[PDB]
């Protein structure tokens, strides 16, 4: 699997500066543009 995207997923998942809406959008971006 692509370890780059997995790292970006995890960092977004646990980013305390993101609320649920911002976290979903950034995870959706990783899911879609990897």
């Amino acid at each position: 699997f692509n370890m780059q995207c997995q790292r970006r997923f995890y960092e977004a998942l646990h980013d305390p500066n993101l609320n649920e809406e911002q976290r979903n959008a950034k995870i959706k971006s990783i899911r879609d543009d990897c």
Binding site: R8, I27, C34
Partner: protein, 207 residues
């Protein structure tokens, strides 16, 4: 009458952004006279509509099995959201509802340790490469093996065992010919768990 089962996603699918976690609703023993089923799906009680429901399939007893599959967002499953399947049928006065979610409780990080074959096992034609995974909570985990950037599929993993401190452990055993092991090939235990950084860690094992 018809009975309903609701299955959680595979642990690996919820953890790896490359995968698609799904929740699976199975209704069995739908009568032959009323072959039609309707599924309603809900996340924390709010109906969702993206389910893949295939047509019902006739079984031996002429009753029908019917499966609906709901894909879920990794972060919603990991954040404890509650997934509900409702099954409606004419043979039923009231629809059946089952609900599932992730195991509750503070997550705990697995410690991963590789243990080489003992000297006594070196006398045999095949040897056991051991991966000890201990201290994790909840019990949802995936363990895999690779070598030289290729998957090794000839392993068996024990079910998680509840330890005395409220955490789980398991062992994974990869069987390899002693010749492969003695030629110094590097093997790796890969563990996927909610409480690991990146949900992923790989430990190496080599002569």
């Amino acid at each position: 009458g018809p009975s309903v089962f609701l299955f959680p996603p595979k642990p690996k699918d919820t953890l790896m952004i490359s995968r698609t976690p799904e929740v699976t609703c199975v209704v069995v023993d739908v009568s032959h006279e009323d072959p039609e089923v309707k599924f309603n799906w809900y996340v924390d009680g709010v109906e969702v509509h993206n389910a893949k429901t295939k047509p019902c399939e006739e079984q031996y007893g002429s009753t029908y099995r019917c499966v609906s599959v709901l894909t879920v967002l990794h972060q919603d499953w990991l954040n404890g959201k509650e997934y509900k399947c409702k099954v409606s049928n004419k043979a039923l006065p009231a629809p059946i509802e089952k609900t599932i979610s992730k195991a509750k409780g503070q997550p705990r990080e697995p410690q991963v340790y590789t243990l080489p074959p003992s000297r006594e096992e070196m006398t045999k034609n095949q040897v056991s490469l051991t991966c000890l995974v201990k201290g994790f909570y909840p019990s949802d985990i995936a363990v895999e093996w690779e070598s030289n950037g290729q998957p090794e599929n000839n392993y068996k993993t024990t079910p998680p065992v509840l330890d005395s401190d409220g955490s789980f452990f398991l062992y994974s055993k990869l069987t390899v010919d002693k010749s492969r092991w003695q030629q110094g090939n590097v093997f790796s235990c890969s563990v996927m768990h909610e409480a690991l950084h990146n949900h992923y860690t790989q430990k190496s094992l080599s002569l």
